[PDB]
Amino acid sequence: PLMVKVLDAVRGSPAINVAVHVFRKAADDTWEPFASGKTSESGELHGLTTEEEFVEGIYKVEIDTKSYWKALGISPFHEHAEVVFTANDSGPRRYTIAALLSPYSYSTTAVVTN
Amino acid sequence: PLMVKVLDAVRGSPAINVAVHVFRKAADDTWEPFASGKTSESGELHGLTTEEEFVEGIYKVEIDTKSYWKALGISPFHEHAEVVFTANDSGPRRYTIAALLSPYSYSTTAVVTN
Amino acid sequence: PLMVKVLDAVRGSPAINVAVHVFRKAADDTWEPFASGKTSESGELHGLTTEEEFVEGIYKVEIDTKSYWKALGISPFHEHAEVVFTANDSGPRRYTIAALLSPYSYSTTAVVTNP
Amino acid sequence: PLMVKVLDAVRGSPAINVAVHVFRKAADDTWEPFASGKTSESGELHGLTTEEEFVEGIYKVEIDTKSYWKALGISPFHEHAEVVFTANDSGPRRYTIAALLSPYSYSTTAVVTNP
Ligand SMILES: Cc1cc(C(=O)Nc2cc(Br)c(O)c(Br)c2)cc(C)c1O
Numbered sequence A, B: 001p002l003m004v005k006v007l008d009a010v011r012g013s014p015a016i017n018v019a020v021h022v023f024r025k026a027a028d029d030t031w032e033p034f035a036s037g038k039t040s041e042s043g044e045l046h047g048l049t050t051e052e053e054f055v056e057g058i059y060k061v062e063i064d065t066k067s068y069w070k071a072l073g074i075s076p077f078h079e080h081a082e083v084v085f086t087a088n089d090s091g092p093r094r095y096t097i098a099a100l101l102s103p104y105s106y107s108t109t110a111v112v113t114n
Numbered sequence C, D: 001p002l003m004v005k006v007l008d009a010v011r012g013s014p015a016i017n018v019a020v021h022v023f024r025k026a027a028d029d030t031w032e033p034f035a036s037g038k039t040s041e042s043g044e045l046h047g048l049t050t051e052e053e054f055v056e057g058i059y060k061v062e063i064d065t066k067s068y069w070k071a072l073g074i075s076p077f078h079e080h081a082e083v084v085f086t087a088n089d090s091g092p093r094r095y096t097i098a099a100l101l102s103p104y105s106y107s108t109t110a111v112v113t114n115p
């Protein structure tokens, strides 16, 4: 039910081998590790979770943009990019978190479908 | 070699049934019709052209954003969204033109791969 | 009543010396030259037109992004970024057309205010 | 040395009365409250800090986008937009953090200048 896709606005390419960490907000308001991985050659990260595990709640997707840029020899502004949202069972069932990266900027959108 | 993908930033969805026209710049600097279609349920428009037909040159992709917004009952700013670029055989072979739409704004990127 | 602002997403800076050409659709459906200029050190382009001259119509703001990037020695994707909109059709408004540029991407937004 | 500007991509207007909370990472690795405020009628938030107080560090600018959209009666996707960056590590700079908001999307950029 959750996919992350990352694109590079400088090279016009997927953002490959980018580390992505997902956290779930705990009762005590701390961020608990939930899922992680690295984007593929297509810039996508599949298989993070299952429907059974992905219950309603607040999640944070942290994209390691700083390492990505440094590995390309580029000095970036941000420490990481964070996307924080609530999963809601009354809306559609599949979430795509998409990010478009530049050294000093990023854009993100949600594509939520059934 | 050419795919167009359109997303909706208001609803968090693909932008479905959006008209897209592609033009090729002619010798006399006019825009000649090249390919067209409507985005699918996934927001994508496949099959516009073939490798044989898609020669180097300047192309314009015009996305009919005004009709899209009006069909959803929303008053938009732009007449359309235009993406104008040169196809170059020395770069990678497949072009994805991606657009992310809002009533008063849009973002576009190119994903160019082999 | 028309201002253009351009930022650079690679540099984290205003986009300086960006050429901008504005056209207005004529009665015969062609794009007539309306005004032009370049962004300043702040990334802003002021003084394009006047409230008398900026009548109702369909306008095209062409931001010369390729020329900008090439002048910086970079080979970008797009030829230009075009922003096409109907203006002043409910009376005079003030328009800011804002753009944010990367070599293979851009975003644009409008800020429309009623004086 | 720190300014936040927020625009609304649905309205084509400044995003007014947007709450913004700034944190700075402490020695113990927690996020310490640093400053806060709200955007004005222009969409800008000035006066958050001073050059004395805005020392080197890792800062988090939290823009309360959900609260903004809910106050407008809209159910948005994100909880907030967070912008996290190292500041002043090569001496004092001026930072503008700019954001452009839609219910299911946002973009952010930085303008960094050397006074
Ligand atoms: C935040 C953002 C994402 C995207 C985006 O990720 N598009 C996109 C989404 C999926 Br799913 C795809 O498979 C592809 Br290809 C592009 C495009 C733009 C112009 C943008 O500003």
Ligand SMILES: Cc1cc(C(=O)Nc2cc(Br)c(O)c(Br)c2)cc(C)c1O
Pocket: C005, C007, C096, C098, C099, C100, C107, C108, C109, C111, D005, D007, D096, D098, D099, D100, D107, D108, D109
């Ligand atoms: C993240 C973003 C910011 C902006 C933006 O905020 N531009 C801007 C910055 C400052 Br300081 C201004 O005074 C004004 Br007007 C616009 C524009 C776009 C198209 C965009 O994607």
